[PDB]
Amino acid sequence: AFELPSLPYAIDALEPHISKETLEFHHGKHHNTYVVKLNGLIPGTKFENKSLEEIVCSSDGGVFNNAAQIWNHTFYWNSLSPNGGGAPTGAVADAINAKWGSFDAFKEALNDKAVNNFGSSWTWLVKLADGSLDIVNTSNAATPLTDDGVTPILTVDLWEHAYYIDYRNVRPDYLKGFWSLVNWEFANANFA
Amino acid sequence: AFELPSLPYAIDALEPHISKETLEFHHGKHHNTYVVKLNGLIPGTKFENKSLEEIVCSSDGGVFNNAAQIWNHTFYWNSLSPNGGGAPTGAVADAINAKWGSFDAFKEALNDKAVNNFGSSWTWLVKLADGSLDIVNTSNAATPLTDDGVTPILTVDLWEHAYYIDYRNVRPDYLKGFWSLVNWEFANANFA
Numbered sequence A, B: 001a002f003e004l005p006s007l008p009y010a011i012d013a014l015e016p017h018i019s020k021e022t023l024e025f026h027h028g029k030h031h032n033t034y035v036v037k038l039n040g041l042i043p044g045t046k047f048e049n050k051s052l053e054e055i056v057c058s059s060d061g062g063v064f065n066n067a068a069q070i071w072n073h074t075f076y077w078n079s080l081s082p083n084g085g086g087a088p089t090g091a092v093a094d095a096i097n098a099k100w101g102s103f104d105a106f107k108e109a110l111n112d113k114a115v116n117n118f119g120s121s122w123t124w125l126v127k128l129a130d131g132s133l134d135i136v137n138t139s140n141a142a143t144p145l146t147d148d149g150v151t152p153i154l155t156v157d158l159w160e161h162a163y164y165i166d167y168r169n170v171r172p173d174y175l176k177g178f179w180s181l182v183n184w185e186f187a188n189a190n191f192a
């Protein structure tokens, strides 16, 4: 049914911020496993012919954990880039300034939400229904995609498999890696 | 203030099932961090004079997450032993045979609960109010210590940091490691 998407860049393209070995396990094993599991759960069910987002927004239990993780990881890979990092640009830079006053205050606010997102989790930059940006944390497979009117803009995976190989227990060091890779083109594409 | 308990065995005593590197990060860094963080949170609350278990059973939020994780890890180190593994003995073996019919059926049941305990979690062997054994899963820092009438007997930490260095994504391989280390003396002590 579903297929694991290709990575949007070569396996060593995020070096030295996220390693090749991390992409091999994170994309090639964890993301793949969610796709295999969902496909095993859907045959001959009321989800067998629905799109992935349709499944994510209409399931619970194991179907939801697997489908939402497939979606969350594809969004995460797009949130990184070997040509990303550095200062934000375009409409998202201005929207960040409108909410937090400055990019540095936004980065401090997102780092604080990410470091403190307890357990397996995701930290998201979203555009609320009212048009403003905000930072929100979700646990396990939960995702702002299920929230009517909220538009996911970027995400950082904080499950330990996302960073343990490269950074062990030090999330702030992984977050420095993330800021060096953040894909402002994808953020702007989602914001607009 | 609280202190990080010593490990009950040498750093390489669980080799080759859990590595020295895993114990250095897992005990020396993760377990330690929960101790430091709790020792920041307590003062100025109705907690600074309470024992660890008293805090675990009457707190929520960050105090609970750090205090429950300190308790859960100390319980987890005691659940392993370089002289453990193999068939269960004593009262716990008999109780296992009473609930599941055989040790092999128990192991299959616990393995299924642990492999499928989604996200950061713990799988516990507990003794119920009625005297029977059961397997229960908790998420993040939740623990049966807070359930009236339930007595924790053994635990397996399923947060990814407990096994990623040694086994990466393969929980079943980590669980084989756990069966080779399970401390039946601690289980029997807790059961009696």
Ligand SMILES: OC[C@H]1O[C@H](O[C@H]2O[C@H](CO)[C@@H](O)[C@H](O)[C@H]2O)[C@H](O)[C@@H](O)[C@@H]1O
Pocket: A060, A061, A062, A063, A065, A140, B116, B117, B118, B119, B121, B137, B138, B139
């Ligand atoms: O996909 C199997 C089940 O996964 C979840 O439940 C598992 O993980 C929980 C922690 O996130 C545990 O509490 C639970 O015991 C496990 O079975 C999901 O919640 C279930 O609905 C799925 O069927």
Ligand SMILES: OC[C@H]1O[C@H](O[C@H]2O[C@H](CO)[C@@H](O)[C@H](O)[C@H]2O)[C@H](O)[C@@H](O)[C@@H]1O
Pocket: A116, A117, A118, A119, A121, A137, A138, A139, B060, B061, B062, B063, B065, B140
């Ligand atoms: O210890 C600080 C807070 O930790 C928890 O909240 C963090 O982790 C949650 C995921 O488990 C996130 O949803 C949340 O946004 C983070 O702040 C705890 O639940 C809070 O009560 C603590 O203050």
Ligand SMILES: [Fe+3]
Pocket: A026, A030, A073, A157, A159, A161, A162
């Ligand atoms: Fe992930």
Ligand SMILES: [Fe+3]
Pocket: B026, B030, B073, B157, B159, B161, B162
């Ligand atoms: Fe742990």
